[PDB]
Design a binder for this molecule. Structure first.
Ligand SMILES: COc1cc(/C=C/C(=O)N2CCC=CC2=O)cc(OC)c1OC
Lengths: 606, 77, 95, 59
C-alpha cells in the first residue's frame, strides 16, 4: 500500500478499501507517522485528511485508522502527530475536529488519547497583520474562540483528558486572554466574547474553584482586564468592569449593591487592577500605554468616570496652584524682559529668578520624559523647549553675546503660549480647545504649505518682470505680496515699468488665488465643523483631564507624595472576600421589582 | 514701537486691517522683529479662525424652539 | 410617624426625600395598595391632609420627588390623580 | 491615475503584469485568474459551503 491510495480511500471515507494496510505495515515494519505517509509540503498525516473530509459530522474511516495504528505499535501516537511546516506548525487533528464544528469526531478523537494540550504555534496562528487567525494556540482556546460551548463543556468535563482552564500558550495567554485578543468592537463579536468569557468564568468557578483565572498574567505581565484595556477593546473591557452575578456566582462579580431604599441605590465597584495606587493600573494603561484611537472612550465608562471625577475634584486645588506658579513666573519674566539695558539689584534678582525657574521646568520635563520613555506630549515638548531656550538664553547672556535678546523674548513669547495648557481645567474652553485642534490643525498646516509655495512662486515672477524699467529682492517682493493677506497690500498701475500690464495681471491673479485659497480653508473647516460629534470631543477632554490627574498624583521630582488609596475595604461575601470598593450612588424610578441581594441592611452616607 | 501703548496700538492695527509690517533697516534686531510680526499675524489668524468655527459649531448644534421659548419668557417678564 | 432624619431631608447627596410620612412614602414608591389600605382601614385613619416638618402634604411631596424623566413623570401623575380622586371621597369637604 | 501609470511613458512601454493567479475553480477543468480577497466574519458559524482548497495558505 502507498500514501496516495491511502489519501484517496480516506478522503472517500470507505473503510473496506483499506484491507491489507495493517498487513503491509506489519510486513514492512514502517509506522504510519513516517515521511512515507505524510505529505512533503505541510507534513499532514492521513488522520488529518480523514477529519478534513467529514460527512455530516462523522467520517466512516476515522476509527479503523486509529485502530490499525494501535495494532501497528507506534511509539508516537498517530493522533498526536502535528504539522511540520513553519506556516502551519502545531496543527493537529484535534484542531481540525474543533474547526469543522463536530462534537462527534471530537469525542471520537479524545477517546483514543488525543493530547488536548497541543500548541498550534505556526505562523498562521500567531498574531500579526494579514492571513492569520490568532485564537490562543490551544484546542480549548480554539473551541472558545469559535463559539462552540459544547466542545468547551466536553473538553473541560470528560474522563479521558482534563484540558485545564489555566493552560497558557507561547505568549503566556490563557483562554481568557485569548478571548480578549480576538475581541473586536463589532456587535456580534462582542456578544460572542462576553458569552464565552462569562461561561468559562462560571465553569472555572467549579472545575478549579481555588484559583482566580482573572489574576493570571501572560509573559508580558497583564491580567485579562489590563490586556483588554491595553489592546483598546472597549466593549469586553466595559463588560468586565461592571459585572454582576446573581446566585452562587456572586464572588465572581465586580459590581455589588450595598443597599436599596426605594429608587435610591448604592453600588460598589471593586478597584482591583484599576485604581492608580498600585503600579500597573488600568487607568495608567489606558492613558500612557494604550495606542488605540478609542482610548478616550475608555475613561468615560461607569466605574471610571466617577473615579476620575473624584480624583480631579480632590486635585483641582493643586492644578490651579501649578497654574498660579506658572502665571507668576511669566509675570516676572515679562517684567524682566521689558526692563533691559534698587533697579539693577532687582533686575539681577529677576534674572536669577527666571534662571532658577527655567532650571526647575527643565528638570521637571526631563523627569517626565525619563518616566514615560502628539496631543499627549504636545505641550510637554513645548514646556521642555521653552525651558531649554530660557536657560540657553541666560547662558548666552553670561557669555556676553549680542544674540541673547532674541532668545530671551522668544522664550517669553513661547511661555505665553504654553499657558494655553491650562485650558483643560474648565469644561467649555477645554472641550473647545480639543475640538479646535482636531478640526483645524491638519487643514491649516496644508493651507500654509500651499500659501508659502504660491507666495514664493509669484514673488520670483514679480521680481523677474519688474527688473527692467521702461520689488527688488525676493524678501521685499514677498513682503509686498504677503501684505495683500493682512489687508494692506498696494496694487497700482505703474508707468516706470516696461512690463506693467502683466505685473498688474500677476498681482490680480495672486489676489484671486489667495481669495480662493482662503475660501478653500474656510469651507474645509466648515465641512469639518458640520461632520463633528461633540461627545467625541467631550471624551477626549476627559482623557486629557485624566492624564493631568494621573501626572499630578506622582508629585514633583523633589517630593514624591504617597498615593492615597480610593474606596474602602468591604466584605463583599465569603470566598471572607474583602475588596476595595468605590461607591457610586444612583436613582432609578423604574426598578420597583427587587430581586437582589444587598451587602448592607441599612443605608448610610459616605 | 517705543512704549507699550504705541506698540500695542501698532499690533492691534493688524486686526482692523491697517497694520503695517515692513523690513526695517535702522533696527539691529530686524529679522527677528519681522518674524515676531509674522508670528503674531499667524497667531491672530488662527485665533479668529478658532472663534469663527466655535461660533459655527454652536450654530449647528442649536435648536430654534429653545430660542423661541426663551423669547417667550423675555416677553412674559 | 415623622421620619425626620438627615437621610430623609432634601439636600444634595445620599438622601431620599419622600415627605417624612408613611402615606407619603407609600405614594412616592408606587404602591397604591399600601396607599388604599392606609387610607381605608378601620384601625388607623392616616389622613390625607397631614404635613411634615416642611409643611409638605403628600401632594407636595409627590411634586418634590418629580423628575422630568419619562417614567418618574408617569409615576407622579398617576399617584397625584389617584390621591386626588381618593381625597374626593375620604375628606370630600377640603380641597 | 493608476490606469495611466500602467501604460508607461511614450519612450518605453512597460509590459502589463497580470493580477491574480491561475486557479482551478472546478470542472467545466475550469482555470481562471482569481484575485484573492481575505475577510473576517464573526456571524457565519453555519458552514454550508464548498471550498476549493482544504488547507489555508498565505498569499
Ligand atoms: C492649542 O489650541 C488652542 C487653544 C486655544 C484656547 C484658548 C482659550 O480658550 N483660553 C486661553 C486662556 C485661558 C482660558 C481660555 O479661555 C486657542 C488657540 O488659538 C491660538 C489654540 O490653538 C489652535
Amino acid at each position: 500500500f502507498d500514501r496516495d491510495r491511502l489519501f484517496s480511500v480516506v478522503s472517500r471515507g470507505v473503510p473496506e478499501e483499506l484491507t491489507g494496510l495493517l498487513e503491509y505495515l506489519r510486513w514492512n515494519s514502517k509506522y504510519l507517522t513516517d515521511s512515507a505517509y505524510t505529505e512533503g509540503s505541510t507534513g499532514k498525516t492521513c488522520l488529518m485528511k480523514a477529519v478534513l473530509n467529514l460527512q455530516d459530522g462523522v467520517n466512516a474511516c476515522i476509527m479503523p485508522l486509529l485502530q490499525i495504528d494501535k495494532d501497528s505499535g507506534n511509539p508516537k501516537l498517530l493522533v498526536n502527530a502535528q504539522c511540520t511546516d513553519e506556516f502551519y506548525q502545531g496543527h493537529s487533528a484535534l484542531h481540525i475536529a474543533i474547526e469543522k464544528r463536530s462534537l462527534q469526531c471530537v469525542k471520537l478523537l479524545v477517546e483514543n488519547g488525543a493530547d488536548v494540550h497541543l500548541r498550534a504555534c505556526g505562523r498562521f496562528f500567531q498574531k500579526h497583520q494579514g492571513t492569520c487567525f490568532y485564537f490562543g494556540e490551544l484546542p480549548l482556546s480554539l473551541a472558545a474562540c469559535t463559539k462552540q460551548w459544547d466542545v468547551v463543556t466536553y473538553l473541560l468535563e470528560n474522563p479521558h483528558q482534563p484540558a485545564s482552564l489555566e493552560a497558557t500558550d507561547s505568549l503566556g495567554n490563557t483562554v481568557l486572554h485569548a478571548l480578549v485578543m480576538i475581541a473586536d468592537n463589532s456587535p456580534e463579536n462582542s456578544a460572542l466574547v462576553i458569552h464565552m468569557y462569562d461561561g468559562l468564568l462560571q465553569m472555572g468557578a467549579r472545575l478549579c474553584p481555588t484559583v482566580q483565572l482573572e489574576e493570571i498574567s501572560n509573559h508580558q505581565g497583564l491580567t485579562p482586564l489590563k490586556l483588554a484595556a491595553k489592546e483598546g477593546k472597549i466593549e469586553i473591557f466595559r463588560h468586565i468592569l461592571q459585572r454582576e452575578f446573581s446566585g452562587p456566582y456572586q464572588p465572581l462579580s465586580r459590581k455589588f449593591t450595598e443597599w436599596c431604599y426605594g429608587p435610591v441605590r448604592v453600588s460598589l465597584y471593586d478597584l482591583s487592577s484599576v485604581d492608580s495606587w498600585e503600579k500597573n493600573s488600568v487607568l495608567e494603561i489606558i492613558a500612557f500605554h494604550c495606542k488605540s484611537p478609542n482610548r478616550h472612550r475608555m475613561v468615560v465608562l461607569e466605574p471610571l468616570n466617577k473615579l476620575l471625577q473624584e480624583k480631579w475634584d480632590r486635585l483641582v486645588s493643586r492644578f490651579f496652584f501649578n497654574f498660579a506658579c506658572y502665571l507668576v513666573y511669566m509675570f516676572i519674566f515679562t517684567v524682566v524682559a521689558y526692563h533691559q539695558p534698587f533697579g539693577e539689584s532687582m533686575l539681577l534678582l529677576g534674572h536669577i529668578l527666571i534662571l532658577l525657574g527655567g532650571i526647575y521646568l527643565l528638570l521637571g520635563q526631563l523627569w517626565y520624559f525619563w518616566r514615560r520613555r502628539f496631543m499627549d506630549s504636545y505641550f510637554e515638548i513645548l514646556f521642555l523647549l521653552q525651558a531649554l531656550l530660557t536657560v540657553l538664553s541666560q547662558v548666552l547672556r553670561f557669555m556676553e553675546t549680542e544674540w541673547y535678546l532674541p532668545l530671551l523674548v522668544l522664550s517669553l513669547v513661547l511661555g505665553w503660549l504654553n499657558l494655553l495648557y491650562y485650558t483643560r481645567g474648565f469644561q467649555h474652553t477645554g472641550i473647545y480647545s480639543v475640538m479646535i485642534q482636531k478640526v483645524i490643525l491638519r487643514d491649516l498646516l496644508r493651507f500654509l504649505l500651499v500659501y508659502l509655495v504660491f507666495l514664493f512662486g509669484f514673488a520670483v515672477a514679480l521680481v523677474s518682470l519688474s527688473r527692467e524699467a521702461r520689488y527688488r529682492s525676493i524678501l521685499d517682493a514677498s513682503l509686498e505680496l504677503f501684505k495683500f493677506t493682512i489687508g494692506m497690500g498696494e496694487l497700482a498701475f505703474q508707468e516706470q515699468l516696461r512690463f506693467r500690464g502683466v505685473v498688474l495681471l500677476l498681482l490680480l491673479a495672486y489676489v484671486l488665488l489667495t481669495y480662493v485659497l482662503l475660501l478653500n480653508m474656510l469651507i474645509a473647516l466648515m465641512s469639518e465643523t458640520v461632520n463633528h460629534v461633540a461627545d467625541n470631543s467631550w471624551s477626549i477632554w476627559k482623557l486629557q483631564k485624566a492624564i493631568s490627574v494621573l501626572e499630578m498624583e506622582n508629585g514633583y521630582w523633589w517630593c514624591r507624595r504617597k498615593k492615597h488609596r480610593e474606596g474602602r475595604l468591604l466584605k463583599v461575601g465569603t470566598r471572607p472576600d474583602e475588596r476595595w470598593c468605590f461607591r457610586v450612588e444612583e436613582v432609578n424610578w423604574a426598578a420597583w421589582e427587587k430581586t437582589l441581594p444587598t451587602l448592607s441592611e441599612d443605608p448610610s452616607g459616605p
